[PDB]
């Protein structure tokens, strides 16, 4: 078809998110109409040149004082969500409508939210590429809320109550459930399911409903170690999730958590950072690099865009394309592998995840079709080495530091005099410049070692070829 609009998401076959009309995740940052007028078009567009193809909107804010005297009634800011559903509609990105909180987050008002969604379900309903998102954080701060001490009480009546009103009104619209800010553990999903339970039994009649057209908004504030073992114990009982807000800094502040991104990625599982759209929200810019695009590219991150060509595509070469983690000490021995063999750089090509100053590899080896140099080596062990490596070339490792400190990074290498190189971790040189040992020949092999002192997470090495005149078999990274 012809006109822009995205076709309704649905629940992918794994039943883990909803999908696109195209099976790809929704990813997307945020705009608000609570106190500000809809961002512009131009702005809008902005999102799908950083690899997105969705949006959050916190629509309206709730009051809690409402319904009396002064109070700001549900509807206020119709003229500006209908621009938002225009620009969103033309521009073929997704839309995850909620109330937004305002200094009140952790907390609803239940007749304000039954109003606002009697009011917005039916203005809406027909808007393919529109989701519902019932309420931001009604809740201080999770699971369960069909506690009678959760604070406040009675929540899941009003996500019972307003699926109704939704339903009744947008027979088709997907609806995110809870919202839960901190979400974290198999405590926490068992308790969501307590909260999952009550909801199924009052609105389909069983307690072990299997959803057609919703799914568990959940933030990322207990963190993303424990946010991935909620999401995991969730998805094994069966119900399909959505994230909705996440940073990486409790604090909504400090850019894309890309350690939690990475996870909802391997669980296949839509999501929507807490970064926003010019010009104006509460937490950071989303096309500042320093919070969204150069974490990405440090990390190595890679998702498949639906619009442009960022993120680059790229990832890593064996270790079931997995980014490869690094070993801990644990009683006395090491959890895993230390070594990355070189001819296992990421693919991606020449001037993304390697640079070889000759477009063919020259050696014949291994990957004969990307542009590094390889040949089989006569070091101990046998297989590859990087060979023909020439001043400024340089080979990408996307790995995973799962503790922050100090690590020897070895190269074993041969070579004649003048050999150097440099190593970056996410960007960040983490060696200086480093004068590799002469062998005498290049296949006379010795390991050179440098501790250098890492930060957590997903983060690209880098070696950049100072010189030539050396050859490397394979790299080293250990704990000290
Ligand atoms: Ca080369
Ligand atoms: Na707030
Ligand atoms: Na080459
Ligand atoms: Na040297
Ligand atoms: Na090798």
């Given at each position: 078809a012809s006109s822009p609009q995205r076709g309704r998401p649905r629940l992918n076959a794994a039943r883990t998110t909803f999908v696109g009309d195209n099976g790809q995740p929704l990813r997307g940052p945020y705009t608000s109409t609570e106190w500000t007028a809809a961002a512009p078009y131009d702005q809008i567009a902005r999102v799908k040149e950083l690899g997105f193809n969705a949006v959050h909107l916190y629509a309206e804010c709730f009051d809690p004082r409402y319904p009396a005297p002064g109070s700001k009634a549900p509807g206020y800011a119709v003229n500006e969500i209908d621009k938002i559903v225009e620009r969103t509609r033309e521009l073929g990105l997704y839309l995850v409508i909620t109330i937004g909180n305002g200094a009140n987050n952790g907390n609803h008002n239940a007749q304000w939210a039954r109003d606002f969604w009697?009011?917005?379900?039916?203005?809406?309903?027909?808007?393919?590429?529109?989701?519902?998102?019932?309420?931001?954080?009604?809740?201080?701060?999770?699971?369960?809320?069909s506690?009678?001490?959760?604070?406040?009480?009675?929540?899941?009546?009003?996500?019972?109550?307003?699926?109704?009103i939704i339903r009744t009104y947008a027979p088709e619209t997907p609806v995110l459930l809870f919202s839960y800010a901190v979400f974290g553990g198999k405590g926490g999903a068992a308790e969501a399911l307590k909260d999952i339970r009550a909801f199924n039994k009052a609105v389909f009649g069983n307690?072990?409903?299997?959803?057609?057209?919703?799914?568990?908004?959940?933030?990322?504030?207990?963190?993303?170690?424990?946010?991935?073992?909620?999401?995991?114990?969730?998805?094994?009982?069966?119900?399909?999730?959505?994230?909705?807000?996440?940073?990486?800094?409790?604090?909504?502040?400090?850019?894309?958590?890309?350690?939690?991104?990475?996870?909802?990625?391997?669980?296949?599982?839509?999501?929507?950072?807490?970064?926003?759209?010019?010009?104006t929200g509460v937490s950071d810019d989303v096309t500042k690099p320093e919070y969204f695009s150069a974490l990405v590219e440090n990390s190595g991150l890679s998702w498949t865009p639906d619009y442009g060509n960022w993120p680059a595509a790229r990832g890593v070469y064996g270790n079931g394309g997995l980014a490869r983690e690094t070993a801990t000490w644990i009683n006395n021995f090491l959890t895993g592998t230390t070594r990355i063999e070189a001819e296992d750089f990421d693919w991606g090509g020449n001037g993304v995840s390697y640079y070889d100053t000759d477009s063919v590899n020259v050696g014949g080896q291994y990957r004969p079709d990307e542009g590094v140099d390889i040949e089989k080596t006569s070091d101990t062990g046998g297989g590859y080495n990087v060979g023909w490596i020439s001043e400024g070339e340089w080979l990408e490792y996307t790995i995973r530091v799962r503790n922050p400190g100090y690590y020897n990074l070895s190269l074993r290498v041969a070579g004649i005099s003048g050999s150097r190189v440099q190593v970056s971790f996410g960007n960040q040189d983490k060696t200086g410049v480093?004068?590799?040992?002469?062998?005498?020949?290049?296949?006379?092999?010795?390991?050179?070692?440098?501790?250098?002192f890492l930060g957590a997470g997903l983060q690209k090495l880098r070696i950049?070829?100072?010189?030539?005149?050396?050859?490397?078999?394979?790299?080293?990274?250990?704990?000290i």
């Open positions: 009697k009011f917005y379900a039916p203005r809406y309903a027909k808007e393919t590429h529109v989701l519902y998102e019932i309420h931001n954080e009604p809740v201080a701060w999770g699971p369960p809320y506690s009678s001490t959760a604070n406040p009480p009675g929540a899941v009546d009003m996500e019972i109550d307003v699926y109704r307690e072990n409903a299997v959803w057609t057209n919703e799914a568990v908004a959940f933030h990322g504030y207990a963190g993303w170690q424990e946010t991935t073992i909620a999401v995991e114990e969730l998805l094994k009982a069966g119900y399909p999730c959505f994230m909705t807000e996440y940073a990486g800094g409790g604090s909504g502040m400090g850019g894309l958590d890309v350690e939690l991104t990475y996870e909802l990625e391997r669980l296949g599982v839509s999501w929507l950072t807490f970064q926003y759209i010019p010009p480093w004068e590799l040992p002469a062998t005498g020949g290049f296949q006379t092999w010795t390991t050179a070692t440098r501790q250098v950049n070829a100072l010189s030539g005149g050396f050859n490397l078999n394979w790299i080293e990274l250990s704990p």
